[PDB]
Design a protein around this nucleic acid. Sequence first.
RNA 1: CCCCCCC
RNA 2: CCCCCCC
RNA 3: CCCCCCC
Lengths: 339, 339
Amino acid sequence: DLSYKHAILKESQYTIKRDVGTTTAVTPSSLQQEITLLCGEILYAKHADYKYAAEIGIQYISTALGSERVQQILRNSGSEVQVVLTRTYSQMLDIHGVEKSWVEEIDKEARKTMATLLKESSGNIPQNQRPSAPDTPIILLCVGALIFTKLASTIEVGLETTVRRANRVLSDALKRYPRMDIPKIARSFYDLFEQKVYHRSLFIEYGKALGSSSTGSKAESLFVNIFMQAYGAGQTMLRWGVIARSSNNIMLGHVSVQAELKQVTEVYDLVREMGPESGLLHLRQSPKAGLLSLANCPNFASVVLGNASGLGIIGMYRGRVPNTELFSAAESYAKSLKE
Amino acid sequence: DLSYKHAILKESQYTIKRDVGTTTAVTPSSLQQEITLLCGEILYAKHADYKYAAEIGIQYISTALGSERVQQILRNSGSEVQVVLTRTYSQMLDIHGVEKSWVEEIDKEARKTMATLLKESSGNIPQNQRPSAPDTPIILLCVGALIFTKLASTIEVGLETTVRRANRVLSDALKRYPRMDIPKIARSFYDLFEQKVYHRSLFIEYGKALGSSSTGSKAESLFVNIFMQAYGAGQTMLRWGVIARSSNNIMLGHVSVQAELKQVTEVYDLVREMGPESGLLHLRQSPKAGLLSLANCPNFASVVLGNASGLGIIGMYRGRVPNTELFSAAESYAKSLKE
RNA sequence: CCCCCCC
RNA sequence: CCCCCCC
RNA sequence: CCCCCCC
């Protein structure tokens, strides 16, 4: 059945159309040196409103890939959003859907903070501490990638995890910019990813275009590391299933587990059939996701969760254990094997 | 999963574009006999500012490979830096991005030192002690290659190691040039490698074009020796893992180590799949680096670090030991086997 | 319906 | 996130 | 870094 369902979904002669009357903003590569400034003036000043930081990160992505490539990416993502270009005025940027009041506020706040830290201090600002640093857009996109790995999770868990992991992953940027509010920027990125779902596709295309590069700075290598940490998002049950098989859990040989193993292997075969893009299904909110669910094998899922709980892997996972006896037996065996 | 991640990163139909509006300097081979002088006038005089010594070494590399080949190397490294040629004026060099005041200062300091060591002394300066010696650019690039092997490490460790190793590796040059400041030149090279990441690719291309040569002086053989000592930079955990396997550590047969051995072998298979260029991934800061991390196998990493600590190989390695009990058991077994 | 830990 | 010793 | 004896 599962192969037939995927065959129906894949073999479609008709293309969906959505967001027909909508538009979005991009910034041409000719403005990259400008957007960098903006992407850094968000980082070293303490701003009251961090509402459009995610849009500025996506603007930098658009400068990197190019306006035409970004339009093509949005078009092939199933969304008929018409790209609107970015202009300059007196210079500053007039990004579509980003209020000019916001850009002026961010620029003025950063200029005032820079003046205050230059007047009082000894005037020895290093090359990495200024807003026009060239890795500041990647530093903002690193907060974006941290909150990207938690798009399958909830908002509160995502924000808490982003802040916790960014105090260590982004320690160097925090030292360079003492006053960068990872919570508010992470909230902005979560809002962008939820509202504009095609920007998940744009962000993934940037991740690919960055990982495929021949050279990169440490910021881009960090961004790619986090982006790849997001790969199996929304499918931790499959990873824990292969973990359970590697652990040689005895309760995998139970009668009901052996009964469901056929369709479990069917799900894994479907994973292989989709191939490399299967991992990005839940990140993209591809409607085709959910063909990879193991919820139709309650006993296998309970055994997998029990094995994970025994090994300590389960952590604070919020999934359901359908069959509690199998869960407890598997947990006991996994603890015994671990000890 | 790891093979699929590498397949996504490798199979990209789009090329990244960075440093679009930026430019860099090269020196044509027709100026090599001139740049040599400069590359040696840094070595036998005591200069207040050693800021652009790395750029002068890279200029000599550009003379060696050629301006067009250097432009091609920069282009295939993922960076759209426009090469700017080097000119002469009254002769001395006007290198782009290198202030003429700096070049004049270095030349004047070297001329004054030469006059002082010729007026006071007996006037028996040998052929190797003069700035126009033809191995002086390679002597500077040897300090550059020493600090190249420490690009995965920190700045302070890199500088300390460079000075310590250069007092012995470069003893002959130090005898020839008593006043050459390995600390400041090493700092200059570290700054160049951090700022201009495409120059890592240029420096690697020089290493290849030198190792492939049919003949070479002792300076070039030393440079190639150090360059090859840099090969596995950023991946000492894989080298220590194969060391642990060679040591036949008993704790490799533990339950959790045997659990993680499958994906460990997956990482090693990915290493083989990338092939010869895998070692230069962390040296180049290739964003694709981090696919080779063994951080997702905490128990294997702890056992490997314990084995290294038992054999005395660990030295002062700053990596984390996730599971302390495995680390201590492996260290005890490794010491027992060593004794 | 699906998702949900850690890195 | 990754990296981190010695030669 | 490498090399280092004798014939």
